[PDB]
Design a protein around this ligand. Structure first.
Ligand SMILES: OC[C@H]1O[C@@H]2O[C@H]3[C@H](O)[C@@H](O)[C@@H](O[C@H]4[C@H](O)[C@@H](O)[C@@H](O[C@H]5[C@H](O)[C@@H](O)[C@@H](O[C@H]6[C@H](O)[C@@H](O)[C@@H](O[C@H]7[C@H](O)[C@@H](O)[C@@H](O[C@H]1[C@H](O)[C@H]2O)O[C@@H]7CO)O[C@@H]6CO)O[C@@H]5CO)O[C@@H]4CO)O[C@@H]3CO
Ligand SMILES: OC[C@H]1O[C@@H]2O[C@H]3[C@H](O)[C@@H](O)[C@@H](O[C@H]4[C@H](O)[C@@H](O)[C@@H](O[C@H]5[C@H](O)[C@@H](O)[C@@H](O[C@H]6[C@H](O)[C@@H](O)[C@@H](O[C@H]7[C@H](O)[C@@H](O)[C@@H](O[C@H]1[C@H](O)[C@H]2O)O[C@@H]7CO)O[C@@H]6CO)O[C@@H]5CO)O[C@@H]4CO)O[C@@H]3CO
Ligand SMILES: OC[C@H]1O[C@@H]2O[C@H]3[C@H](O)[C@@H](O)[C@@H](O[C@H]4[C@H](O)[C@@H](O)[C@@H](O[C@H]5[C@H](O)[C@@H](O)[C@@H](O[C@H]6[C@H](O)[C@@H](O)[C@@H](O[C@H]7[C@H](O)[C@@H](O)[C@@H](O[C@H]1[C@H](O)[C@H]2O)O[C@@H]7CO)O[C@@H]6CO)O[C@@H]5CO)O[C@@H]4CO)O[C@@H]3CO
Ligand SMILES: [Ca+2]
Ligand SMILES: [Cl-]
Length: 496
């Protein structure tokens, strides 16, 4: 449940948010496999309701109507093809499992659904599963509105409707079994694990009873007896009634404190500074490393009013975002997920983006293909952060240094910091408003190394900055505060 089941030596996954299955299959072969990525988190592959007010938002995909594999990302054949092809080049697929609820209680009855299934939300009828009224928690929720009125009461949080979504009676074996049958179909197809959506809104015990029904992973790609990787979405920034430790028995948990705090530090808000990161990880009150799934932003909080609020760093804030993603990927804490986004027209009204609903790039509702430019960037308003040099090389950095201890920390008492990973990697940051120019101990063997932030090692040369390390492990690092990327990283595989 805790082991990611990636190929040996691969240490991150990427959220290819709202990508079509055919484009993910191609990306696995032409890019993710060759560049050392461990796997992909995909958008929910099961049938959802069609929302027309507003027009096809991203979040319609968190409103299930059946477990048929039929969505705007593609159909069941295309999903299978993607899983097979990705696994065949060593890139695992992790599914976003939406299991707490079905669609909105206020939605109209009919067949406005991604595969044409019928449903009647008002009467709690979902004949394509099938579910009926007694498979929901309406009788169990004690609030007058039927919704969550206080997050201080763990019963309401779990038994009542999250933003009006019909809440499944997860205590019942019939419901646990219908969900297990869906997840087991995906496992047998070749999926490696699951994100469990909205885990805060289910009882840890109910989740566990579903997980105990799951198959071992498919032996065409995994060793016999392998269990699916499980990571649960629980938002707990501390001082809440529900704690992320309640879920540790089932698998890993999203550590949302990580991006919220790192965002604040890198922006230098609330008196925070990078020198405080010396004891990052458990030292900051975070969950144990072997239970954590970490990330700078996710698909919800990149829109600026989720967990972390305005502190969250995203691709819109590109320069600081790269700094935060770089720090994350170099630091040993947690298992890392990299975000991959699309661009939308932000429209702020009272510090609130009123266009935060906008769905992926589309022609009249049909998701646009991911086009690849000659310079390796993406077209059609797909951002492709995972293709940015600074991000892809730090993904490789994490592979190269896997297993090596945190070492050789240095700071200037303010916002210049450095550290290494054993004798295989070293990274240096300048987030201060003045020049960094210092000779630091790197822990690496003497030689000339390419900086993998400003360039690449190509043949026997570097395309960006070169760092000469003395026989005693020291090197000079010079970084201006006006550098495009105010950080440098070198590792064992970037040595000439
Ligand atoms: O009246 C025009 C409208 O008619 C039809 O909408 C149906 C819809 O198909 C039904 O399912 C139902 O809608 C329910 C929702 O199911 C329920 O969730 C809730 O909706 C709230 C929304 O969730 C929330 O986003 C907000 O909606 C805003 C919306 O974001 C704006 O974009 C704007 O919506 C306009 C649409 O963009 C436009 O296409 C058209 O919509 C048609 C729709 O295509 C058709 O299927 O006009 C609307 C209105 O300008 O404004 C809305 C409203 O502020 O808030 C809503 C409401 O709380 O509740 C609704 C109502 O039951 O019923 C409608 C028919 O009323
Ligand atoms: O496909 C959905 C569902 O649709 C229909 O259910 C209707 C039904 O037509 C109506 O008669 C009425 O329900 C009746 C029952 O007919 C009657 O038996 C009794 O309910 C009791 C049951 O005898 C008892 O077993 C229990 O039902 C369990 C059931 O054993 C579980 O399997 C699970 O039910 C699921 C079914 O397995 C599944 O096939 C389908 O059911 C059809 C059904 O065939 C069809 O007639 O879905 C349901 C869940 O979606 O859980 C239930 C709940 O425990 O419940 C009681 C024992 O106290 O009396 C009711 C009168 O309400 O209305 C339903 C619509 O809800
Ligand atoms: O149609 C359903 C729903 O779909 C979409 O919800 C998205 C949303 O865009 C994401 O931001 C996220 O929602 C998070 C919240 O960020 C998080 O805070 C929490 O939700 C709590 C709210 O923070 C809190 O304010 C309160 O919500 C009230 C809410 O103020 C009321 O307006 C009412 O909700 C209605 C919405 O106004 C209406 O638009 C629609 O909901 C959409 C939503 O617009 C859309 O973005 O219908 C509901 C009808 O009730 O009531 C609730 C009180 O229940 O408390 C909630 C907790 O209930 O958690 C959510 C979940 O992640 O993700 C969802 C997609 O799931
Ligand atoms: Ca629930
Ligand atoms: Cl998440």
């Amino acid at each position: 449940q805790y082991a990611p089941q990636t190929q040996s030596g691969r240490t991150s996954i990427v959220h290819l948010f709202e990508w079509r299955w055919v484009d993910i299959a191609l990306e696995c072969e032409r890019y993710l496999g060759p560049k050392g990525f461990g796997g992909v988190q995909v958008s929910p592959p099961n049938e959802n309701i069609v929302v027309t007010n507003p027009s096809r938002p991203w979040w319609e995909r968190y409103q299930p109507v059946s477990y048929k594999l039929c969505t705007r990302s593609g159909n069941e054949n295309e999903f299978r093809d993607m899983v097979t092809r990705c696994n065949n080049v060593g890139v695992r697929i992790y599914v976003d499992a939406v299991i707490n609820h079905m669609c909105g209680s206020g939605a109209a009855a009919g067949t406005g659904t991604t595969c044409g299934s019928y449903c009647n939300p008002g009467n709690r009828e979902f004949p394509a599963v099938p579910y009926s009224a007694w498979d929901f928690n309406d009788g169990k929720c004690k609030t007058a509105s039927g919704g969550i009125e206080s997050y201080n009461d763990p019963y309401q949080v779990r038994d009542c409707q999250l933003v009006g979504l019909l809440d499944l009676a997860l205590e019942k074996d019939y419901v646990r079994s219908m969900i297990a049958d869906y997840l087991n179909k995906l496992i047998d197809i070749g999926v490696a694990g699951f994100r469990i959506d909205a885990s805060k809104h289910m009882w840890p015990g109910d989740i566990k009873a579903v997980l105990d029904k799951l198959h071992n992973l498919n032996t065409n790609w995994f060793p016999a007896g392998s269990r699916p990787f499980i990571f649960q979405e629980v938002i707990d920034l501390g001082g809440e009634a529900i704690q992320s430790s309640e879920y540790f028995g089932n698998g890993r948990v999203t550590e949302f404190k990580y991006g919220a705090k790192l965002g604040t530090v890198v922006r230098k808000w609330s008196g925070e500074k990078m020198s405080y990161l010396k004891n990052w990880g458990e030292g900051w009150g975070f969950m144990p490393s072997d239970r954590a799934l970490v990330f700078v932003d996710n698909h919800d909080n990149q829109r600026g009013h989720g967990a972390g609020g305005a502190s969250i760093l995203t691709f819109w804030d590109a320069r600081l975002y790269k700094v935060a993603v770089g720090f994350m990927l170099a630091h040993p804490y947690g298992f890392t997920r990299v975000m991959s986004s699309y661009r939308w027209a932000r429209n702020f009204v009272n510090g609130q983006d009123v266009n935060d609903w906008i769905g992926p790039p589309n022609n009249n509702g049909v998701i646009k293909e991911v086009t690849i430019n000659a310079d390796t960037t993406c077209g059609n308003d797909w951002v492709c952060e995972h293709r940015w040099r600074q991000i892809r090389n730090m993904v490789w950095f994490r592979n190269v240094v896997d297993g090596q201890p945190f070492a050789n920390w240095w700071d200037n008492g303010s916002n210049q910091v450095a550290f290494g990973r054993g004798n295989r990697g070293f990274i240096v940051f300048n987030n201060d408003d003045w020049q960094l120019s210092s000779t630091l101990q790197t822990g690496l063997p003497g030689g000339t190394y390419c900086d993998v932030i400003s360039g690449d090692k190509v043949g026997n040369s570097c395309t960006g900055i070169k760092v000469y390390v003395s026989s005693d492990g020291t090197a000079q690092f010079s970084i201006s505060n006006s550098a495009e990327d105010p950080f440098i990283a070198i590792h064992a595989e970037s040595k000439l």
